[PDB]
Protein backbone atom coordinates (compact mmCIF):
# COMPACT_ATOMS: atom_id res chain seq x y z
CA UNK A 1 0.00 0.00 0.00
CA UNK A 2 2.98 2.30 -0.45
CA UNK A 3 2.75 5.13 -2.97
CA UNK A 4 5.19 3.64 -5.52
CA UNK A 5 4.05 0.00 -5.76
CA UNK A 6 0.42 1.10 -6.26
CA UNK A 7 1.25 2.52 -9.70
CA UNK A 8 3.04 -0.71 -10.66
CA UNK A 9 0.05 -2.76 -9.48
CA UNK A 10 -2.29 -0.53 -11.51
CA UNK A 11 -0.05 -0.98 -14.57
CA UNK A 12 -0.08 -4.75 -14.00
CA UNK A 13 -3.88 -5.00 -13.81
CA UNK A 14 -4.21 -2.64 -16.80
CA UNK A 15 -1.88 -4.83 -18.87
CA UNK A 16 -3.79 -7.93 -17.72
CA UNK A 17 -7.16 -6.45 -18.75
CA UNK A 18 -5.76 -5.21 -22.08
CA UNK A 19 -4.37 -8.70 -22.74
CA UNK A 20 -7.57 -10.52 -21.72
CA UNK A 21 -9.73 -8.32 -23.97
CA UNK A 22 -7.76 -9.36 -27.06
CA UNK A 23 -7.70 -13.00 -25.88
CA UNK A 24 -11.51 -12.99 -25.71
CA UNK A 25 -11.69 -11.15 -29.06
CA UNK A 26 -9.52 -13.85 -30.66
CA UNK A 27 -12.30 -16.47 -30.51
CA UNK A 28 -14.77 -14.25 -32.37
CA UNK A 29 -11.97 -13.53 -34.84
CA UNK A 30 -11.17 -17.24 -35.28
CA UNK A 31 -14.70 -18.61 -35.68
CA UNK A 32 -14.87 -17.08 -39.17
CA UNK A 33 -11.43 -18.52 -39.95
CA UNK A 34 -12.59 -22.01 -38.97
CA UNK A 35 -15.75 -21.57 -41.07
CA UNK A 36 -13.67 -20.54 -44.09
CA UNK A 37 -11.45 -23.58 -43.58
CA UNK A 38 -14.25 -26.13 -43.32
CA UNK A 39 -16.15 -24.53 -46.21
CA UNK A 40 -12.99 -24.68 -48.33
CA UNK A 41 -12.52 -28.36 -47.50
CA UNK A 42 -16.18 -29.13 -48.33
CA UNK A 43 -16.40 -27.46 -51.76
CA UNK A 44 -15.94 -29.36 -55.03
CA UNK A 45 -14.68 -27.27 -57.97
CA UNK A 46 -17.12 -25.59 -60.34
CA UNK A 47 -15.33 -26.95 -63.44
CA UNK A 48 -16.27 -30.52 -62.51
CA UNK A 49 -19.57 -29.88 -60.71
CA UNK A 50 -21.23 -27.90 -63.52
Amino acid sequence: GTEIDSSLRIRAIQQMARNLRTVLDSFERGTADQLLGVLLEKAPPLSLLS
Binding site: S6, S7, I10, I13, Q14
Partner: protein, 197 residues
Protein backbone atom coordinates in the same frame (compact mmCIF):
# COMPACT_ATOMS: atom_id res chain seq x y z
CA UNK B 1 4.13 -4.88 -54.66
CA UNK B 2 5.93 -5.23 -51.32
CA UNK B 3 2.71 -4.16 -49.58
CA UNK B 4 0.49 -6.35 -51.78
CA UNK B 5 2.43 -9.57 -52.42
CA UNK B 6 3.59 -9.82 -48.80
CA UNK B 7 0.50 -10.28 -46.58
CA UNK B 8 2.05 -9.98 -43.11
CA UNK B 9 5.81 -10.56 -43.15
CA UNK B 10 8.50 -13.07 -42.13
CA UNK B 11 8.99 -14.22 -45.72
CA UNK B 12 11.31 -17.13 -46.44
CA UNK B 13 13.84 -17.42 -49.29
CA UNK B 14 11.37 -18.49 -51.99
CA UNK B 15 8.72 -15.84 -51.34
CA UNK B 16 11.37 -13.11 -51.14
CA UNK B 17 12.90 -14.28 -54.43
CA UNK B 18 9.50 -14.24 -56.17
CA UNK B 19 8.78 -10.82 -54.64
CA UNK B 20 12.17 -9.58 -55.89
CA UNK B 21 11.40 -10.75 -59.44
CA UNK B 22 8.00 -9.00 -59.23
CA UNK B 23 9.78 -5.87 -57.97
CA UNK B 24 12.18 -5.94 -60.93
CA UNK B 25 9.33 -6.37 -63.44
CA UNK B 26 7.25 -3.62 -61.80
CA UNK B 27 10.12 -1.13 -61.63
CA UNK B 28 10.90 -1.83 -65.28
CA UNK B 29 7.25 -1.41 -66.30
CA UNK B 30 5.84 1.49 -64.24
CA UNK B 31 8.66 3.98 -64.80
CA UNK B 32 7.04 6.71 -66.93
CA UNK B 33 3.42 5.66 -66.38
CA UNK B 34 1.85 9.04 -67.22
CA UNK B 35 3.84 10.29 -70.24
CA UNK B 36 3.63 6.79 -71.77
CA UNK B 37 -0.05 5.94 -71.22
CA UNK B 38 -1.24 9.47 -72.01
CA UNK B 39 -4.00 8.29 -74.37
CA UNK B 40 -5.60 6.04 -71.70
CA UNK B 41 -7.00 8.07 -68.77
CA UNK B 42 -8.40 4.87 -67.21
CA UNK B 43 -4.94 3.45 -66.42
CA UNK B 44 -3.77 6.77 -64.93
CA UNK B 45 -6.91 7.02 -62.78
CA UNK B 46 -6.41 3.38 -61.76
CA UNK B 47 -2.79 3.82 -60.66
CA UNK B 48 -3.36 7.16 -58.91
CA UNK B 49 -5.95 5.37 -56.76
CA UNK B 50 -3.37 2.67 -55.96
CA UNK B 51 -0.81 5.36 -55.08
CA UNK B 52 -3.26 7.09 -52.74
CA UNK B 53 -4.59 3.88 -51.16
CA UNK B 54 -1.16 2.32 -50.78
CA UNK B 55 0.09 4.45 -47.84
CA UNK B 56 -0.87 3.99 -44.19
CA UNK B 57 -2.57 6.84 -42.29
CA UNK B 58 -1.18 8.62 -39.23
CA UNK B 59 -2.27 9.75 -35.77
CA UNK B 60 -5.71 11.34 -35.46
CA UNK B 61 -5.38 14.18 -32.94
CA UNK B 62 -6.77 17.50 -34.18
CA UNK B 63 -8.93 20.43 -33.10
CA UNK B 64 -9.53 22.32 -36.36
CA UNK B 65 -8.60 20.54 -39.58
CA UNK B 66 -8.70 21.20 -43.31
CA UNK B 67 -12.07 20.54 -44.93
CA UNK B 68 -14.13 21.53 -47.96
CA UNK B 69 -17.28 23.68 -47.94
CA UNK B 70 -19.65 20.78 -47.20
CA UNK B 71 -17.79 19.42 -44.18
CA UNK B 72 -15.88 16.40 -45.44
CA UNK B 73 -12.32 16.48 -44.13
CA UNK B 74 -9.47 16.04 -46.59
CA UNK B 75 -7.17 13.03 -46.72
CA UNK B 76 -3.88 14.55 -47.88
CA UNK B 77 -2.13 16.53 -50.60
CA UNK B 78 -1.02 15.38 -54.07
CA UNK B 79 1.66 17.91 -55.02
CA UNK B 80 2.45 17.99 -58.74
CA UNK B 81 3.95 19.90 -61.65
CA UNK B 82 1.58 22.38 -63.34
CA UNK B 83 1.66 20.42 -66.61
CA UNK B 84 0.73 17.24 -64.74
CA UNK B 85 -1.95 19.17 -62.83
CA UNK B 86 -3.46 20.38 -66.11
CA UNK B 87 -3.35 16.86 -67.58
CA UNK B 88 -4.99 15.43 -64.44
CA UNK B 89 -7.69 18.10 -64.31
CA UNK B 90 -8.64 18.12 -68.01
CA UNK B 91 -9.85 14.53 -68.41
CA UNK B 92 -8.79 12.15 -65.61
CA UNK B 93 -9.79 13.36 -62.14
CA UNK B 94 -13.01 15.14 -61.20
CA UNK B 95 -13.26 18.39 -59.24
CA UNK B 96 -14.93 17.99 -55.85
CA UNK B 97 -14.76 21.64 -54.73
CA UNK B 98 -13.24 25.02 -55.57
CA UNK B 99 -12.82 26.45 -52.05
CA UNK B 100 -11.63 24.90 -48.80
CA UNK B 101 -11.70 25.74 -45.09
CA UNK B 102 -8.18 25.92 -43.67
CA UNK B 103 -7.11 26.74 -40.09
CA UNK B 104 -5.45 30.09 -39.43
CA UNK B 105 -4.01 29.78 -35.93
CA UNK B 106 -0.85 27.80 -35.21
CA UNK B 107 -1.20 26.55 -31.64
CA UNK B 108 1.73 27.40 -29.40
CA UNK B 109 3.42 25.57 -26.55
CA UNK B 110 5.32 26.90 -23.53
CA UNK B 111 6.91 25.66 -20.31
CA UNK B 112 5.89 27.23 -17.01
CA UNK B 113 5.21 26.17 -13.44
CA UNK B 114 6.25 22.55 -12.99
CA UNK B 115 7.75 22.23 -16.48
CA UNK B 116 9.98 25.27 -15.93
CA UNK B 117 11.40 24.01 -12.62
CA UNK B 118 11.74 20.49 -14.07
CA UNK B 119 13.72 21.87 -17.01
CA UNK B 120 15.88 24.13 -14.84
CA UNK B 121 16.63 21.70 -11.99
CA UNK B 122 16.83 18.16 -13.40
CA UNK B 123 17.04 18.97 -17.12
CA UNK B 124 13.97 17.21 -18.52
CA UNK B 125 10.51 18.27 -19.67
CA UNK B 126 7.30 16.80 -21.06
CA UNK B 127 4.23 18.11 -22.88
CA UNK B 128 1.42 18.84 -20.44
CA UNK B 129 3.07 17.75 -17.18
CA UNK B 130 0.12 19.17 -15.21
CA UNK B 131 -2.37 17.09 -17.22
CA UNK B 132 -0.26 13.91 -17.10
CA UNK B 133 0.28 14.32 -13.34
CA UNK B 134 -3.44 15.00 -12.82
CA UNK B 135 -4.45 11.90 -14.78
CA UNK B 136 -1.87 9.70 -13.03
CA UNK B 137 -2.84 10.96 -9.56
CA UNK B 138 -6.59 10.71 -10.21
CA UNK B 139 -6.09 7.17 -11.56
CA UNK B 140 -3.77 6.19 -8.67
CA UNK B 141 -4.68 8.01 -5.44
CA UNK B 142 -8.53 7.67 -5.10
CA UNK B 143 -10.71 4.61 -4.47
CA UNK B 144 -12.31 2.13 -6.90
CA UNK B 145 -14.65 4.82 -8.29
CA UNK B 146 -12.00 6.25 -10.63
CA UNK B 147 -9.10 3.76 -10.87
CA UNK B 148 -10.40 1.01 -13.25
CA UNK B 149 -10.80 3.27 -16.30
CA UNK B 150 -7.76 3.86 -18.52
CA UNK B 151 -9.06 4.33 -22.09
CA UNK B 152 -6.50 5.01 -24.82
CA UNK B 153 -7.95 8.18 -26.35
CA UNK B 154 -7.16 11.81 -27.10
CA UNK B 155 -8.37 12.82 -23.59
CA UNK B 156 -7.10 16.44 -23.43
CA UNK B 157 -8.49 17.51 -20.07
CA UNK B 158 -8.49 21.21 -19.07
CA UNK B 159 -6.27 22.76 -21.80
CA UNK B 160 -7.20 26.42 -21.43
CA UNK B 161 -7.07 28.99 -24.28
CA UNK B 162 -7.43 28.38 -28.01
CA UNK B 163 -8.97 29.61 -31.24
CA UNK B 164 -11.23 27.26 -33.28
CA UNK B 165 -11.82 29.38 -36.39
CA UNK B 166 -11.60 28.64 -40.11
CA UNK B 167 -11.16 30.71 -43.27
CA UNK B 168 -12.38 29.99 -46.79
CA UNK B 169 -9.47 29.70 -49.23
CA UNK B 170 -9.66 29.14 -53.03
CA UNK B 171 -7.96 25.82 -53.79
CA UNK B 172 -8.96 22.98 -56.10
CA UNK B 173 -9.89 19.67 -54.46
CA UNK B 174 -10.09 16.39 -56.37
CA UNK B 175 -11.36 12.97 -55.35
CA UNK B 176 -9.52 9.69 -55.96
CA UNK B 177 -10.88 6.28 -54.96
CA UNK B 178 -12.76 7.11 -51.77
CA UNK B 179 -10.38 9.79 -50.45
CA UNK B 180 -10.65 13.56 -50.86
CA UNK B 181 -7.21 15.10 -51.44
CA UNK B 182 -5.77 18.47 -52.37
CA UNK B 183 -4.14 18.93 -55.79
CA UNK B 184 -1.60 21.76 -55.62
CA UNK B 185 1.02 22.39 -58.32
CA UNK B 186 2.51 25.41 -56.62
CA UNK B 187 4.92 27.07 -59.08
CA UNK B 188 3.64 30.66 -59.34
CA UNK B 189 2.91 31.31 -55.67
CA UNK B 190 6.41 30.03 -54.79
CA UNK B 191 9.57 29.38 -56.90
CA UNK B 192 8.54 32.13 -59.35
CA UNK B 193 11.00 34.91 -60.30
CA UNK B 194 13.50 33.61 -57.72
CA UNK B 195 16.79 31.81 -58.23
CA UNK B 196 15.80 28.51 -56.53
CA UNK B 197 15.03 25.59 -58.84
Amino acid sequence: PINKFQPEGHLNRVARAALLSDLKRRVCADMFFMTRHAREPRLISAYLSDMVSCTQPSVMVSRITHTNTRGRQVDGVLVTTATLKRQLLQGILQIDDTAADVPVTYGEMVLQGTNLVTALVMGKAVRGMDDVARHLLDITDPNTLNIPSIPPQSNSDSTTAGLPVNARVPADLVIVGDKLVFLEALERRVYQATRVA
